Design a protein around this nucleic acid. Structure first.
Lengths: 97, 116, 183
RNA sequence: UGGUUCCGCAUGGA
RNA sequence: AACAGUGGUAGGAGAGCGUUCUAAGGGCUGUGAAGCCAGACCGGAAGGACUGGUGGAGCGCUUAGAAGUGAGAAUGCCGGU
RNA sequence: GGAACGAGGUAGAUGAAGAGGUCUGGAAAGGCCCGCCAUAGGAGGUAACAGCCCUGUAGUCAAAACUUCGUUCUCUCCUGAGUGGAUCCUGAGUACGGCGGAACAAAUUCCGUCGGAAUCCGGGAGGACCAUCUCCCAAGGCUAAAUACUCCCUAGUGACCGAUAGUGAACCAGUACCGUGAGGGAAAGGUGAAAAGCACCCCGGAAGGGGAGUGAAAGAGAUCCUGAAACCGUGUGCCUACAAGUAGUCAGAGCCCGUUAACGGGUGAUGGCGUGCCUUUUGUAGAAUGAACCGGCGAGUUACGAUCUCGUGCAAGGUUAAGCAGAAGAUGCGGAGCCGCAGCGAAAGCGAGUCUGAAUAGGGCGCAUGAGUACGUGGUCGUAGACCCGAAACCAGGUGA
């Protein structure tokens, strides 16, 4: 605590104006002379690869931040789910595995 | 905080009013007109470190030109033959500081007509 | 790290922070600043509206200052992750140079400050120090407050400052088990 | 001006 | 270590010195501290240091965060001449 | 409508330990070598910087008389309801229409302005609003708490100011002055530890001096600490009465001096060169603007929002707000939120697929190739007085024949 030296490149002296002729900017101080619409966000298919794939526990794992209406499963990535809305790609991907 | 700052202005104005020590009239008391004749007296003293480099030349030439008229030669005739026969690269200063000693100058003056 | 204490593996290890450690100390100085400085203005000066432009102006000696500091308060915050990863690091400086000293139970009977001077003589601690005890031992807190160098700390109320200033730390072992639980 | 399952306030309509 | 280069306003970028303050330490002061006046010293600049007189209660230094700013110009304002 | 038991508030009481020894000084609270107290080393005085010198603090207890809260008693009071809606009730100039205002297609609010109703089968609303369905009962009246703010009054803290500051005002200040009046509105702190504030002598009418005394200091003698600069002087080394100069600058004898010892210091007869400073302009020497001089004061960053760079933590997951606990503090505890991991129409829908589109063709967008995010420093750009300084006018309330 005697010599608390801050990290290099973390602080910079504040620029002044009118405090020197050779310092710059002193004379003129450098100033010249629908209604309802549901949204299921984006449920990536690669986010479930880390793992009873329900939305109740999906929001507690970090996969789902906000809870809007229901929950749709997209088949963007490649890997017992009981939700509601499921994309065609995901459905086929879930049945293929 | 609030910073009055009285101890920092006079020590910034003594060091100007010390460099004016010896001027005429009011120009060594009033700070408002001692700052001009310090900012100008550093400006002449740069301009006149180039003239005394070039106006000692017109001294040494005028003395050599008189010391060459003892032998009929002018300055242009002398320096022309001082580089031909003789291989010396003697300064126009040190070919002038020996003007007092006639014997010395004469010796070097004899070589001027040797290749002329 | 476990020795024979004193009878008169994740907290303090290695890999000191540094940049983050300094950040925590910078945010502990601003808060402590009370910040109650106010100055007048050109408008809140008991001044005239007519031309004598106006008798209380920025250039006038009777008027106030142009800018000037107004009633403000600077209170920033680190994240929660950067608020518990530094208290270990200042602890970790102390496991290096043996500045930690561990005692059992901080044995006291009354509030005699003559005992603590014998205890500081006994542990051979000289300058400012710390005392951390988990249960708010009232004989400890009522003592030693008058002894000028030292201070006692209820173990939850540790913070990144007093470990740096007081530079050595008389700890009861009963408080060591508590401090991993919060962090 | 007029084309057109354009939408349509707990459930039907304009 | 050889070359290459160094006029410069608007304007852009970079590196520095100072002025008060509250603390982690460290240390001078009644055998005389700030402030004041001298000086023929030191540093590339802003600026520092040492002797001598005057003063009769305090100051200062590498180290970190903040600075009611560091003035020669306002047909500036108050005082003095 | 009363009476006891507690906590307070306004007065105080009590309170631990060194003349340590020695040095310098006018004077130890300093040094130097020692001792001691602490539920107490918070402050303030003391002839210099005190824990133990006092006034006090931490601690404990204190109020006759007032009041301020409560706990307890006195005291005071007083039905809850089983089934039936057979018959009555449930808030009348109102619920509502026309006309016109206002202020939150157009209700709405709310007044006038004339019309104007039924009512448990009921009644009301669910955007000028039409049919199903839920929720709830208009036109009776009262209601603490958590909040807003201080002229005040106690206790205290300031990365607040220290006499051109801070309030206008540290001082017999809203005073003195100015104005008929409403109103405007200053200037001005400091002897000394102590008043010990000059017995007496001398000149003078006295003021003011010189001695003498006091004092550590009279260079401290009443606008009295320190006492700068402009301005005014008196001495003294070197120059100056044939000389045309932004006053200086290089060269330079002579002459006088001795230093933070250094290719010294001060003057300079004479030769060379040399159109002040700042602002502004295509451009300066200008008569283009500004300054009598000295000193003081005097002009770009503050939380709120945008955007980028840098630093740092975690990283396809990052982050808490308000608030409650704890010296107005860090710190916990708080997962309500926000931001991100993916898109297109003037009006609706899947998901690596489109909006306009017979179209499996051209044009649309975006990924493939994926890092944000929470703070912090600085950069600009904003909104508010927003570089500082500076008009004429306009309105509201007032004062004057």
């Amino acid at each position: 605590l005697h010599e608390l030296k801050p990290s290099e490149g973390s602080r910079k002296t504040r620029n002044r104006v009118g405090r020197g002729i050779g310092s710059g900017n002193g004379k003129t101080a450098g100033k010249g002379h629908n209604i309802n619409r549901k949204e299921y966000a984006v449920v990536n298919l690669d986010k479930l690869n880390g793992f009873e794939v329900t939305p109740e526990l999906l929001l507690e794992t970090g996969v789902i931040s906000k809870l809007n209406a229901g929950v749709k499963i997209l088949g963007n990535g490649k890997l017992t789910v009981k939700a509601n809305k499921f994309s065609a790609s995901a459905k086929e991907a879930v049945e293929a595995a | 905080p609030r910073v009055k700052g009285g101890t920092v202005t006079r020590k910034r104005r003594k060091k100007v009013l010390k460099l004016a020590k010896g001027y005429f009239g009011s120009k060594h008391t009033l700070y408002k007109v001692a700052n001009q004749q310090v900012m100008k007296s550093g400006n002449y003293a740069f301009r006149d470190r180039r003239q005394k480099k070039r106006d000692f030349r017109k001294l040494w030439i005028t003395r050599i030109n008189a010391a060459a008229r003892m032998n009929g030669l002018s300055y242009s005739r002398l320096m022309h033959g001082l580089k031909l026969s003789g291989i010396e690269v003697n300064r126009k200063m040190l070919a002038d500081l020996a003007v007092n000693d006639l014997t010395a100058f004469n010796q070097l003056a004899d070589a001027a007509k040797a290749q002329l | 790290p476990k020795v024979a204490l004193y009878n008169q593996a994740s907290v303090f290890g290695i890999e000191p922070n540094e940049s983050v450690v300094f950040d925590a100390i910078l945010m502990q100085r601003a808060s402590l600043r009370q910040g109650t400085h106010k100055v007048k203005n050109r408008s809140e000066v008991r001044g005239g509206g007519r031309k004598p432009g106006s008798i209380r102006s920025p250039q006038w000696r009777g008027g106030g200052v142009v800018f000037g500091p107004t009633p403000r308060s600077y209170s920033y915050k680190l994240p929660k992750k950067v608020r518990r990863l530094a208290i270990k690091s200042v602890l970790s400086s102390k496991v290096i140079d043996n500045n930690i000293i561990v005692l059992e139970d901080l044995t006291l009977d009354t509030a005699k400050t003559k005992e603590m001077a014998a205890i500081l003589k006994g542990l051979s601690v000289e300058k400012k120090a710390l005392i951390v005890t988990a249960d708010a031992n009232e004989a400890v807190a009522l003592s030693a407050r008058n002894i000028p160098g030292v201070t006692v700390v209820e173990a939850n109320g540790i913070n990144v400052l007093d470990v740096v200033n007081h530079e050595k730390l008389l700890i009861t072992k009963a408080a060591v088990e508590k401090v991993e639980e919060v962090l």
